[PDB]
Ligand binder design. Structure first.
Ligand SMILES: [Cl-]
Ligand SMILES: [Cl-]
Ligand SMILES: [Cl-]
Ligand SMILES: [Cl-]
Ligand SMILES: [Cl-]
Ligand SMILES: [Cl-]
Ligand SMILES: [Cl-]
Ligand SMILES: [Cl-]
Ligand SMILES: [Cl-]
Ligand SMILES: [Cl-]
Ligand SMILES: [Cl-]
Ligand code: NA
Ligand code: NA
Ligand code: NA
Ligand code: NA
Ligand code: NA
Lengths: 119, 119, 119
């Protein structure tokens, strides 16, 4: 059946606020593979990419039922796109077959939802 | 399998407007237990809490298929938090095990989604 | 059983208006003949809300389908119909005999939708 579901909406402006006000924010949210892509983007695209990843990982953590913390790190979750451009999640704590995700954007927001199934 | 799904996004300012214009708005949306929690919150927190509950119950009513009205009241739905802080719904019209919810917020919005499974 | 894919979309009403104004028969491109009949019956404001909602639903469906809108799936391959209570449901014959669930929501400035396709 369904193990859990998660939804997150993130304001891009906030991601810009949290980002600069640190100096380690993007690197804490993104994995090595994600960072490789992130560093090639323009300032504008970087914010959209980071906001999208942040939302997807937050949604995943909610579906997981614990949120980000001691039981689950942003580094434990990686978003990729298949050959059709569809995002999917790989998480070292469960089978990718049990996970579904969707990501969307508007000028000012990034949002994502995740559904985890019990196999 | 899946019986129904529901999504809702609610503008905090609209909630605050209705709460100011309407008599007993919080009392109409919240159960006794939620009201007890609501009344211990600051003015700002109250609006966020209320908007989140409203979004969650709206989402639930859409998944249930009846919407809020004669067949289902806001009073028939209660959101609780487990030991990890994860929200879950209690509605005696169905088993708690068949329901899954997720709630999110931004500065100006509250949003929620629900998935009800057939057991 | 099991979930085939999920999709989420948030669309800015102002952007739909911006696209509908500067473009050809934008509404005609997004909507099927039956949706158009419903569309033409609405006021200027309602048309924008209706179009944004249907657009969000088709985008969300395209994301659950896993390809997005394009060569593999057209806006015209997806139809949002209304049941006896005026609530939306999706018909996509291009989709194997699977079950499709959809939920649409609105705020003053946005339209949003989510879809779950079960295999
Ligand atoms: Cl946010
Ligand atoms: Cl990738
Ligand atoms: Cl997606
Ligand atoms: Cl926007
Ligand atoms: Cl549904
Ligand atoms: Cl609203
Ligand atoms: Cl009591
Ligand atoms: Cl949640
Ligand atoms: Cl906001
Ligand atoms: Cl948009
Ligand atoms: Cl439906
Ligand atoms: Na890192
Ligand atoms: Na709303
Ligand atoms: Na947020
Ligand atoms: Na959008
Ligand atoms: Na529905």
């Amino acid at each position: 059946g369904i193990y859990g579901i998660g939804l997150d909406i993130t304001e891009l402006k906030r991601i810009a606020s949290m980002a600069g006000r640190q100096k380690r924010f993007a690197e804490r949210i993104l994995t090595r593979s994600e960072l490789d892509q992130y560093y090639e983007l323009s300032e504008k695209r970087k914010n959209e990419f980071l906001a999208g990843r942040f939302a997807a990982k937050e949604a995943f953590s909610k579906a997981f039922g614990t949120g980000i913390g001691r039981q689950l790190s942003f580094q434990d979750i990686e978003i990729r796109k298949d050959q059709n451009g569809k995002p999917y999640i790989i998480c070292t704590k469960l089978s990718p077959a049990a996970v579904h995700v969707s990501i969307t954007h508007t000028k000012e927001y990034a949002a994502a939802q995740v559904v985890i199934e019990r196999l």
